[PDB]
Design a protein around this ligand. Sequence first.
Ligand code: NDP
Ligand code: LDT
Ligand code: CL
Length: 313
Amino acid sequence: MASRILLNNGAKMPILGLGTWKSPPGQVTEAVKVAIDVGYRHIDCAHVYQNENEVGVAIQEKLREQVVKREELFIVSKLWCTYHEKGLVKGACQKTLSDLKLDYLDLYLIHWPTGFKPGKEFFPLDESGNVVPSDTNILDTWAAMEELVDEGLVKAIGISNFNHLQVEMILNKPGLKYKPAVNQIECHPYLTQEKLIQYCQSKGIVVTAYSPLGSPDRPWAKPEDPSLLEDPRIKAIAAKHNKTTAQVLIRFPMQRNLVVIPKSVTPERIAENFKVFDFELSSQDMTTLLSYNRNWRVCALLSCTSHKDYPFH
Ligand SMILES: NC(=O)C1=CN([C@@H]2O[C@H](COP(=O)(O)OP(=O)(O)OC[C@H]3O[C@@H](n4cnc5c(N)ncnc54)[C@H](OP(=O)(O)O)[C@@H]3O)[C@@H](O)[C@H]2O)C=CC1
Ligand SMILES: O=C(O)COc1cc(F)ccc1C(=S)NCc1ccc(Br)cc1F
Ligand SMILES: [Cl-]
């Protein structure tokens, strides 16, 4: 496999990147250093993750060491929900750039379609526990993202967690200027997203699969929950190929023409997750992994579900 995919903005995106949600701030710097030493060239970030500063320390040291050049790196971040206001989008992007020690992002996403009342709180609630919406819609927020391309802050814009009607609403926006480059959605063998992926790929949007390992460190993990890394069906495919389960979970979206962003702070795992270019899953391996779909989401949130734009009804 070619190591990069061509986007509808003309740039090439490494198909394998490093995730950073939940990476503790005292470990994420070494994580990203090691990642780069062993060959990673794409890092996935977000402001709501609260660790962009520490990610940035690593990026910067490897650039300084001349281990890599900036052009050889592909750095992604996302606009949080309390910043769906015309007047808040740019500042939100800039805070992220500052923290990352960068002067552009390769890609910037609307993290979720729902806007919330702005303020300090990432999730503002009424006295009864409902998120307090913003009256601002996804079309007006998109217009605000387009502006960031046009300002040089970001090389590409995209969406995250948009449903088909919401992607359509974006694509049908009166006066649309830049199509989304990417829709980053949860995707793994238990939420395989074929409908939304085909809709998006048919429209030339590249899909990035998040939580490709099923996010075992998610904070609301319940013991009863399904586990990809421990799914023996998947372990078997791995053994056949003389690879790890994680290596298969990573190679899977790669062969669907997806980008994939597994998270780790463990040095040996970071090296392991990169050794995914010297083997191929067969077609049969691929269909088999697809068959595991159960419409199971890592990422959903009850306090947000009455919001007019909550994506998952
Ligand atoms: N757009 C959105 O709304 C969302 C975006 N994302 C993005 O996607 C990234 C990946 O998703 P995320 O939810 O973090 O979860 P992942 O599916 O990437 O799983 C991460 C977990 O897997 C472990 N792990 C990593 N490599 C291995 C390996 N080789 N063997 C065993 N365990 C391993 C990590 O442990 P350890 O770190 O201890 O090594 C960590 O606990 C996020 O970090 C974030 O960047 C995720 C959710 C939502
Ligand atoms: O969101 C991430 O990238 C990873 O997850 C998170 C990462 C954070 F740093 C803080 C909260 C979340 C949550 S609780 N995310 C789920 C979620 C948020 C908002 C809406 Br609308 C629906 C929803 F399902
Ligand atoms: Cl964010």
